[PDB]
Amino acid sequence: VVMTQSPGTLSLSPGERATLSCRASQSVSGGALAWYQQKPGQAPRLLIYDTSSRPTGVPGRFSGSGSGTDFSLTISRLEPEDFAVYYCQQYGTSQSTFGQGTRLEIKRTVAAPSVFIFPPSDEQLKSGTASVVCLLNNFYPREAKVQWKVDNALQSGNSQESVTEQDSKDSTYSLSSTLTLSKADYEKHKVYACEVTHQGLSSPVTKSFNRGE
Amino acid sequence: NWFDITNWLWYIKKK
Amino acid sequence: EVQLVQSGGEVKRPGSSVTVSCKATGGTFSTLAFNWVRQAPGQGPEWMGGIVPLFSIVNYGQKFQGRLTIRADKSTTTVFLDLSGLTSADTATYYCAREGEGWFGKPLRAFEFWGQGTVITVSSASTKGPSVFPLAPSSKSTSGGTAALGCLVKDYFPEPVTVSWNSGALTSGVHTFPAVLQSSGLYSLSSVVTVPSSSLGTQTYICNVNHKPSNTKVDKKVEPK
């Protein structure tokens, strides 16, 4: 049985009403459906068991519903601590399965990322490698496309990205994309650029530097 | 289902 | 208190076998089902198996059969997880969860109590400290605006690395990104901070990188170009 949660990411406001869906590939016997909440760095917390029953300690704003192959978790009033990842788990058969999860994040105004490009340092250059770091500071939403251009040549497969968690104060995300090269390949070229495409940007913003200027 | 096994013992032990 | 205390984190080589413990204290043990659920970096939980300690009735996931062994010790109230033939796809956090009790302790099957987790890093790479390289603030920063600087914590094994700024005095505007696993098998992360441009020439910014597995403490000063 394959569990599929919906949507992938739910962007709502604090105090609004939240509804998360869980769809099973086949019928779940006896209503054996559970809803777990998980915050980054912690073990999941059981919010709902047996489709609709609620364990002691879970506030009344969480309520489960559904039957057969369609299930739904409902948070009547979203509190500050109710934004996290939610997983639905079936356990009617001998082989329990979880869902891919739903990311319940905070909705806010669209903010453009502040883009900063950093060339490799000389101390790193004398070691044999070169890392060019592009930074997208404080933006919303978190979907952003970063593209590296070494003398107008599109790079692919030599850059890694990582995004921070949603900030607890401004609900913004920060992204970091590092381009790793050898010193030889780094000195074979001059212009290094990282162009960013985001919703809060009218045109893709390119931050570049010439090697040695 | 194995997840229900602990329930049987719960019933049988209770009665 | 119903507490589940697991064993410490471990670094295992590919093909070896690992054993994770789970001390259950303050609740029913024999007639309640324990479960082992792992979670890869950046992914969701995945149920692996379970056991009923009374008669050692185990239930293994079809994916992990032939490679999994869950055991129970009723004398010491402990649940174990033996996983052989470790691969890179087994590097995750392993949680031991006990089901919940309802009216008259009715086994609710769903997992209510969880342990603190056991981080298993399945990699051969030797324990190495990180090389800290400065992300200097650009010389073209906005005159009277905001500047950005940071440190690049590159090539270290294993996790984790704790990064602070000015020994912990500077906290505002600091972003320490989650580490990424490079192709070389080593980890790497970046820690940036945004400061007023009018303080780049006077204020001294120092990033503090601390790696416990390598006993490495590096202090790196970031200054403009």
Author numbering:
A (entry chain L): 2 to 27, 27A, 28 to 213
B (entry chain G): 671 to 685
C (entry chain H): 1 to 52, 52A, 53 to 82, 82A, 82B, 82C, 83 to 100, 100A, ...
Quoted passage from the original study:
MPER bnAbs show outstanding breadth, neutralizing up to >98% primary isolates, but have uncommon features. Notably, long heavy complementarity-determining region (CDR) H3 loops with aromatic residues at the tip facilitate bnAb binding to the hydrophobic MPER and nearby membrane. DNA sequencing revealed PGZL1 was from subclass IgG1, whereas most MPER bnAbs are IgG3s. Using X-ray crystallography and cryo-EM, we determined the orientation, angle of approach, and composition of the PGZL1-Env interaction.
To elucidate potential membrane interactions of PGZL1, we solved crystal structures of PGZL1-MPER671-683 and unliganded H4K3 in the presence of a short acyl tail phosphatidic acid (06:0 PA) at 3.42 Å and 3.11 Å resolution, respectively. We observed lipid-binding sites in both antibody structures. The first lipid site in PGZL1 and H4K3 is in a similar location in 4E106, proximal to CDRH1 S28, F29, and S30. Fitting of the PGZL1 lipid-bound Fab crystal structure into the cryo-EM map confirms the antibody orientation relative to the bilayer and suggests both HC and LC contact the membrane. To explore the topology of the PGZL1-Env interaction, we obtained a cryo-EM reconstruction at 8.9 Å resolution of a full-length Env of isolate AMC011 in complex with PGZL1 and PGT151. Despite notable structural heterogeneity between the well-resolved ectodomain vs. detergent–lipid micelle containing the TM and cytoplasmic tail, we classified a subset of particles and reconstructed a 3D map with one PGZL1 Fab bound to one MPER of the AMC011 trimer.
